[PDB]
């Protein structure tokens, strides 16, 4: 049937939310690098 609930091939949430970057440390620098892996 077409009314029986089936799960989709691509499961879970299909979107992501950007996260705010860290607060810049108050040295004399403009270049701020978030923790780099």
């Amino acid at each position: 049937c077409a009314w029986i609930p089936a799960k989709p091939l691509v499961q879970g949430a299909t979107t992501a939310q950007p996260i705010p970057g860290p607060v810049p440390v108050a040295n004399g620098s403009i270049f701020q690098s978030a923790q780099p892996i």
């Binding site: 108050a26 040295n27 004399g28 620098s29 403009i30 270049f31 701020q32």
Partner: protein, 303 residues
């Protein structure tokens, strides 16, 4: 006096700003806009912002306008309202920026935030460079940076050149002047100074320190060779060892194998090397071979 000429202070640094702008007023020595579309596009953006909408897909060929990149240096402790100097550089098929004027241009940091606004008249030297100019007091500071100067009881003097004896000399001088336990060397490039807590007391301390005088210790023997410009420089620590040298067209003033005596000071080195009668061009090759053999008791750097 001297320490201010050898070190910098931690937290007191410069940053860089860059922006895009237009230069108007040229005597027909601007871009050929049929090959630089961003020129006409940004001119249309400016006109639209001012209140004039030019129809799209129309003919437009200017001659008195050039698209430029503006670069500046954000100074330490900069306050809003002050002024800095900017450098203006052409960026497409322009002939000259002789008598141009820079229109309102925002200067961004690396985080894409506006830190200064630039506008003024360009001074081109007037051979000389035509597509590059400098504007004096051409930008005004709009944003300020936070800093943690004055917080804590420790500053760091950062040497300009690594050395252990030099760091120890600076430490000993500061301790001789400003009390027993005032300074401490961390490594070959840092001196940690204890300062009273506050903002004015630290300024008094750094004003007292920056004008002290220290005697520079002998550095490393080194020979700098700039092959691109064709220059050779040897500081006062270079020595030599006795050895023979041969090179094309060079002879004794005798065969082609010339002797070189030992040399303790620099005058002896200059004399013994001038004895060979070689241009700097050949002197480079001679010095490289001598360093490879073992005569040259120095440190060769090709810059």
């Amino acid at each position: 006096e001297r320490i201010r000429d050898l070190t910098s202070v931690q937290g007191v640094r410069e940053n860089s700003l860059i922006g895009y702008g237009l230069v108007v007023g040229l005597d027909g020595t601007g871009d050929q806009t049929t090959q630089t579309p961003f020129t006409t596009q940004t001119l249309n953006n400016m006109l639209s912002q001012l209140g004039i909408t030019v129809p799209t897909g129309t003919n437009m060929q200017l001659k008195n306008v050039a698209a430029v990149m503006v670069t500046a240096s954000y100074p330490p402790f900069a306050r809003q309202g002050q002024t800095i100097d900017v450098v203006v550089s052409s960026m497409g098929n322009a002939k000259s920026l002789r008598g141009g004027t820079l229109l309102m241009t925002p200067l961004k940091g690396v985080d894409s935030q506006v830190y200064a606004l630039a506008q003024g008249n360009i001074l081109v030297g007037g051979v000389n460079q035509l597509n590059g100019g400098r504007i004096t007091n051409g930008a005004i500071i709009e944003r300020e940076l936070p800093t943690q100067f004055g917080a804590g009881n420790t500053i760091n003097l950062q040497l300009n050149d690594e050395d252990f004896t030099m760091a120890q000399q600076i430490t000993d001088a500061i301790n001789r002047a400003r009390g027993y336990g005032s300074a401490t060397a961390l490594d070959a490039r840092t001196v940690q100074v204890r300062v009273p807590s506050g903002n004015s007391s630290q300024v008094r301390f750094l004003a007292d320190i920056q004008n002290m005088e220290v005697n520079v210790t002998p550095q490393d023997a080194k020979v700098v060779i700039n092959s691109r410009t064709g220059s050779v420089v040897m500081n006062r620590e270079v020595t030599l060892d006795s050895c023979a040298v041969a090179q094309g067209n060079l002879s004794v003033t005798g065969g082609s194998l010339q002797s070189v005596r030992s040399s303790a000071n620099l005058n002896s080195v200059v004399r013994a090397l001038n004895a060979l009668g070689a241009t700097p061009m050949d002197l480079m090759s001679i010095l490289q071979s001598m360093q490879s053999a073992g005569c040259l008791r120095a440190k060769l750097e090709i810059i």
